[PDB]
Amino acid sequence: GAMNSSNYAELFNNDIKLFVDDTNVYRVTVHKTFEGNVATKAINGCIFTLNPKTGHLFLKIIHTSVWAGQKRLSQLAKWKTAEEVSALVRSLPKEEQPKQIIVTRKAMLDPLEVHMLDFPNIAIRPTELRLPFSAAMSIDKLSDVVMKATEPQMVLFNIYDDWLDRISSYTAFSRLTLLLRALKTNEESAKMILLSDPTITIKSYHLWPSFTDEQWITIESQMRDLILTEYGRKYNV
Amino acid sequence: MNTVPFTSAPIEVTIGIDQYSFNVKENQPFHGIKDIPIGHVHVIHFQHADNSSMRYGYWFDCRMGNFYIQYDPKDGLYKMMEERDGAKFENIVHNFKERQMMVSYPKIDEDDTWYNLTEFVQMDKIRKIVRKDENQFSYVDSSMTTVQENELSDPAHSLNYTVINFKSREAIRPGHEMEDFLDKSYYLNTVMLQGIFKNSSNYFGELQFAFLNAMFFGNYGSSLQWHAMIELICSSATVPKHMLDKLDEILYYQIKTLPEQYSDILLNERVWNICLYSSFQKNSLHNTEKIMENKYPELL
Ligand SMILES: NCCNC(=O)CC1CCCCC1
Numbered sequence: 001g002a003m004n005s006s007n008y009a010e011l012f013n014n015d016i017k018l019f020v021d022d023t024n025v026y027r028v029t030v031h032k033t034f035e036g037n038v039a040t041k042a043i044n045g046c047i048f049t050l051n052p053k054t055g056h057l058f059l060k061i062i063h064t065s066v067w068a069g070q071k072r073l074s075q076l077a078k079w080k081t082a083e084e085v086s087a088l089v090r091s092l093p094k095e096e097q098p099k100q101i102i103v104t105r106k107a108m109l110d111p112l113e114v115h116m117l118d119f120p121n122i123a124i125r126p127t128e129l130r131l132p133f134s135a136a137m138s139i140d141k142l143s144d145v146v147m148k149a150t151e152p153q154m155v156l157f158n159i160y161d162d163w164l165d166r167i168s169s170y171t172a173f174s175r176l177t178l179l180l181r182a183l184k185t186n187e188e189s190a191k192m193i194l195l196s197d198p199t200i201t202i203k204s205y206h207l208w209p210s211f212t213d214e215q216w217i218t219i220e221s222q223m224r225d226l227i228l229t230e231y232g233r234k235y236n237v
Numbered sequence: 238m239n240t241v242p243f244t245s246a247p248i249e250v251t252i253g254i255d256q257y258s259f260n261v262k263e264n265q266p267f268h269g270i271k272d273i274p275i276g277h278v279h280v281i282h283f284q285h286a287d288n289s290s291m292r293y294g295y296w297f298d299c300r301m302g303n304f305y306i307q308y309d310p311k312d313g314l315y316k317m318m319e320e321r322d323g324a325k326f327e328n329i330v331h332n333f334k335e336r337q338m339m340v341s342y343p344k345i346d347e348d349d350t351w352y353n354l355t356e357f358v359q360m361d362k363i364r365k366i367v368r369k370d371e372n373q374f375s376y377v378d379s380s381m382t383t384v385q386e387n388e389l390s391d392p393a394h395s396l397n398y399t400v401i402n403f404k405s406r407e408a409i410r411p412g413h414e415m416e417d418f419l420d421k422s423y424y425l426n427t428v429m430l431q432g433i434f435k436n437s438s439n440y441f442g443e444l445q446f447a448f449l450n451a452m453f454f455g456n457y458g459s460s461l462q463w464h465a466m467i468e469l470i471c472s473s474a475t476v477p478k479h480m481l482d483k484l485d486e487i488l489y490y491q492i493k494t495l496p497e498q499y500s501d502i503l504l505n506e507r508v509w510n511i512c513l514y515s516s517f518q519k520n521s522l523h524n525t526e527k528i529m530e531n532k533y534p535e536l537l
């Protein structure tokens with residue numbers, strides 16, 4: 001059934017599973033027409049499909065041409081997501097296919113279920129966690145590959161860089177969700193935190209800076225402070 | 238006009254004949270029902286005064302044989318039987334009509350309520366949903382489960398309604414996933430009507446039979462089937478115009494006949510609100526929306 005704080009360690013067991021987040025699939029800039037009406041212009045989007053145990057990210061880039069001539073795009077985007085996730089599963093060798101797919105938004109359940117009818121043994125699950133994966137486009141290297149795409153494209157990343165050499169996947173996911181929650185609550189401040197010190201660089205083959213274990217504790221503390229501050233600045237506390 | 242005689246009435250029971258119901262006292266001199274409308278199927282049904290558990294009854298068509306009821310004290314129910322000796326059955330029924338021991342089926346029906354509830358219902362199709370091939374009549378009760386219920390346990394006692402499942406490979410063409418899920422016309426017209434039922438009359442027959450089993454026996458699987466068959470039509474953008482007009486008449490009479498105090502359990506709020514106000518056919522069921530709004534606005 002639904003995934004929540006009670007069964008949270010299930011994410012890091014040895015059953016292959018994927019999170020699917022569809023919040024950046026259908027994106028637009030929304031502007032005024034010469035006549036003074038409002039219009040939208042779609043921009044490139046992406047499906048965020050993540051193995052939380054290994055860090056493997058299947059980033060399917062959604063090029064604006066897929067919306068050309070289509071109606072009811074927010075509804076179509078859910079079915080396009082489900083079509084691309086099903087296509088990804090079919091492309092994986094049998095022993096790499098997931099046993100469970102967890103969707104971050106409940107409106108993806110029926111489209112994914114219908115597209116995965118051929119896979120009756122793969123469970124499609126909602127979650128009650130409010131995961132911050134929408135902020136994936138605040139990661140510079142991910143945003144860059146999405147906006148530069150001229151055609152549909154899949155790009156594979158490890159969203160944990162090399163962290164799993166030194167920490168467990170439970171700890172890596174907790175770090176990732178902290179970073180993304182901060183980028184979602186105040187992107188400018190979070191990015192200042194991550195890059196303030198110019199001696200700490202991002203390897204060419206990485207997404208995040210090359211922090212020592214000690215610097216990660218400082219960084220994580222600065223992110224917690226940011227989130228708590230904003231939550232004060234927000235509710236006045 | 239035909240007759241369903243009773244050997245006796247040894248236990249106190251409410252007997253219903255189609256939409257009519259009457260009370261028979263324990264060992265009351267009762268020998269059956271006469272003046273039954275030839276040309277319709279009929280249902281004779283029972284609720285014991287002692288144990289309201291298990292409503293049960295029999296679907297029959299008097300053109301297919303001479304049927305009677307006799308109480309079995311071992312199995313504890315009123316059983317329908319067929320008498321093969323015609324000469325004798327007619328002789329006994331005559332005696333009974335002479336002593337005025339039989340109650341009379343009402344003949345006026347301005348409403349035409351029973352024709353309209355059973356317009357498409359045929360005994361031969363009932364007997365394929367309810368498989369007991371040695372009898373010409375079909376037993377149904379409140380507890381019998383459907384084939385679809387059994388896939389999610391005694392096969393001989395099941396209701397073999399046509400399985401309808403909107404998230405199934407039968408319902409969804411590979412490559413038309415979004416199309417077929419949001420517009421069920423393929424599944425209605427090609428799979429079910431052309432493929433399985435052959436025509437809309439057989440579809441409506443099963444829909445009407447499911448409703449009547451839901452209403453008369455409180456059979457939950459039958460209620461599920463009735464609503465599924467409604468929802469499949471309303472959720473199709475492309476439906477023959479004659480079918481929509483006939484569906485509106487069918488449902489109108491079903492909602493008209495449903496006891497007001499059974500609406501909570503026999504009507505599915507989600508299906509009816511979707512069908513009347515959100516579906517492709519939201520504007521095609523004028524008579525049904527009018528009685529639904531007058532009789533049952535709370536559900537909506
Ligand atoms: N319950 C509906 C009443 N309908 C009648 O007109 C009277 C009943 C009809 C069946 C014979 C016994 C009396």
Ligand SMILES: NCCNC(=O)CC1CCCCC1
Nearest residue numbers: 242243244305320325326329
């Ligand atoms: N058990 C064999 C004999 N059974 C009957 O004589 C039944 C009669 C049939 C006509 C209707 C009233 C009772």
Ligand SMILES: NCCNC(=O)CC1CCCCC1
Nearest residue numbers: 493497528530531532533534
């Ligand atoms: N209160 C709005 C009108 N509704 C009724 O007067 C109830 C009747 C019950 C039988 C069928 C017609 C409606």
